């Protein structure tokens, strides 16, 4: 189906000279890509956004999706906390930046425009136990320091 | 207080859940060990038992500290 591409840069909701995908109506400015594209060097062939890349690679299969994300989160055996988030970036297309909503309504003299203008009116275990014991020794010595200060102010 | 174990909620219906956080997630006593039943790894429980041990030694030391400091307060009052 020959759908229409969005005349606004889907990342910045503005019009210009933008690169559009052939499988979804999303169009993006040249600077919005991650990393951004050079307009002199346009890719030869059918160009798609990151979302379509993920959609065709995973082939819309939930089982393969869960398999790959499980393998990757296993690969994050040291950074597992941010694994779920980090698996979300490389699947979806980009957007521009706006500060959060509750931050906006803390101060009333700051205002927004429709354009976005804002104006004012293993070895790791050894190391961790070592840090444990060094801080514990420091704290017991500081407690004895408390006690010695007490004993000196009360004897003197 | 009472039980720490579910029954055998066997078959397909049971849902195994892998945590996203492995150091202070507590959640139950129905753990399942791997290389709603909450799976976990050996090194994780290693860390958690070290946490128990060191927090316990810290609070024991602090109890002795408050004991001795009340002792010193009641002595200096005399």
């Amino acid at each position: 189906i020959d759908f229409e591409n969005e005349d606004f840069c889907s990342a910045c909701n503005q019009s210009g000279s933008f690169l559009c995908c052939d499988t979804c109506p999303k169009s993006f400015h040249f600077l919005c890509l991650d990393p951004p594209i050079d307009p002199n060097n346009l890719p030869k062939g059918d160009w798609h956004c990151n979302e379509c890349k993920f959609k065709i690679f995973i082939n819309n299969s939930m089982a393969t999706l869960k398999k790959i994300e499980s393998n990757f989160i296993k690969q994050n055996n040291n950074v597992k906390i941010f694994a779920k988030l980090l698996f979300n970036i490389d699947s979806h297309n980009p957007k521009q930046f706006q500060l959060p909503n509750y931050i906006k309504e803390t101060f009333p003299a700051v205002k927004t425009g429709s354009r976005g203008q804002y104006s004012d009116e293993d070895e790791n275990s050894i190391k961790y136990d070592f840090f444990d014991k060094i801080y514990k020794s420091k704290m017991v010595q500081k407690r004895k320091l408390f006690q010695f200060q007490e004993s000196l102010i009360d004897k003197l | 207080k009472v039980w720490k174990k579910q029954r055998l909620i066997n078959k397909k219906n049971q849902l195994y859940y892998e945590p996203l956080q492995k150091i202070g997630y507590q959640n139950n006593g129905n753990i399942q060990i791997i290389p709603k039943i909450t799976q976990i790894d050996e090194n994780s429980i290693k860390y958690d038992f070290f946490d128990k041990i060191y927090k316990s030694k810290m609070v024991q030391k602090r109890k002795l500290f408050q004991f001795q400091e009340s002792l010193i307060d009641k002595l200096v009052s005399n």
Partner: peptide, 30 residues
Amino acid sequence: NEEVTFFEKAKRYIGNKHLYTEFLKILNLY
């Protein structure tokens, strides 16, 4: 350090895998 040696000694001495699983289950319950 020496506690890593504690747990490795346990893994070797208790010997079988299932019994070490049971040890760890006790340790986690506590």
